[PDB]
């Protein structure tokens, strides 16, 4: 689900779950316009300011996992199977080849 929604405090949540970036959960400046990039780079623009101040604030963590390595949990979110957990670690390393 790519339907990302901002909050009044500025954090990125998907279905109420905060989005995970390279610095952990993604927090974006409050009241800013966001442009996700082909590699997940998040650029924040403050309204009123000139377009010269567009500066990135983080990067979405995009991971690659086939259907064999993921099993659905009871809350609708997929997670690594035990084998795949022991093979590729508990925390998946982000793949830079993923386009978005």
């Amino acid at each position: 689900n790519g339907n990302i929604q901002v909050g009044p405090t500025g954090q990125l949540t998907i279905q109420g779950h905060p989005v995970i970036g390279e610095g952990g959960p993604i927090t974006v400046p409050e009241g800013s316009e966001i442009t996700i990039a082909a590699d997940g780079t998040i650029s924040a623009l403050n309204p009123g300011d000139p377009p010269n101040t567009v500066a990135p604030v983080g990067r979405l963590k995009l991971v690659k996992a086939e259907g064999n390595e993921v099993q659905r949990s009871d809350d609708g979110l997929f997670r690594l199977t035990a084998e795949a957990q022991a093979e590729r670690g508990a925390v998946l390393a982000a793949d830079p080849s993923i386009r978005i």
Partner: protein
């Protein structure tokens, strides 16, 4: 209900405004002291969608991203304050301006208006008024038994009475100049009033630091160039054609969606 239809509607309205300006310019060809008007348009807003200059990828940025524009809207109509060609009407009371000045008149309300037209008459009381009966400042009083009225280049109004070899001065016609001449509010009746964008009225003698020279027996006709108006009429007609075609094309597209 669909964006392209609003954009084409705005285009149609702008072209209709341009045609209205053209028709107004052509309707005032015979008006003395008339200045032709030209409208200037601007585009309206721009939908952001994808902010250009954003990070397209960690090391690269988006060059000239996706901006969707709205229609068009007229900014303002500017006058062309240029010396309209002069004409000899051989009348002692017609006055024309060679430079950049204006005559001052008093409205019945007590306020002061400014007119460039110099077709003047005399009322029953002997004061110099315009064609609409408004009393021209500074209130030159022409006496009962006048034989000839002489208005010089510097604005002196003199009356030559019977049997006197010297002429009697009865007033002094001054001209008002503005910092921004196009900013005046036209109320019709060949009258312009001062606004805050037209600076302040600077009174000056006709021949001094930039007021024009007054010519007696001359009238300043309108500066409307008619061949330009015909070519612009052709242009406006073709543009209205194209905008109406855009409207019709959008109409044809929505029909297929209704049919779906």
């Amino acid at each position: 209900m669909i964006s392209s239809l609003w954009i084409a509607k705005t285009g149609l309205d702008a072209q209709q405004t341009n045609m209205d300006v053209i028709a107004n310019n052509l309707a005032n060809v015979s008006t003395n002291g008339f200045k032709r008007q030209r409208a200037v348009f601007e585009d309206l807003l721009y939908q952001t969608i994808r902010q250009p200059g954003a990070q397209s990828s960690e090391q690269t940025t988006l060059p000239s991203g996706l901006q969707i524009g709205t229609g068009v809207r007229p900014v303002a109509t500017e006058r062309l304050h240029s010396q309209g060609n002069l004409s000899q009407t051989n009348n002692s009371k017609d006055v024309a301006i060679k430079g950049q000045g204006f005559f001052q008149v008093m409205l019945p309300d007590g306020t002061s208006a400014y007119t460039r037209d110099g077709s003047f008459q005399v009322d029953q009381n002997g004061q110099l008024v315009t064609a609409g009966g408004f009393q021209v400042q500074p209130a030159i009083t022409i006496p009962a038994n006048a034989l000839s009225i002489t208005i010089g280049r510097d604005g002196v109004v003199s009356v030559t009475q019977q049997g006197q070899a010297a002429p009697v001065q009865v007033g002094q016609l001054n001209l008002t100049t503005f910092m921004n001449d196009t900013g005046l509010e036209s109320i019709g009746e060949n009258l312009y009033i001062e606004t805050q964008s037209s600076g302040a009225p600077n009174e000056s003698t006709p021949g001094l630091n930039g007021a024009g020279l007054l010519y007696q027996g001359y009238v300043e006709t309108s500066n409307v160039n008619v061949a330009e108006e015909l070519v612009n009429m052709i242009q406006v007609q073709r543009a209205y054609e194209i905008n109406s075609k855009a409207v019709s094309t959008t109409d044809q597209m929505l029909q297929k969606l209704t049919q779906l």
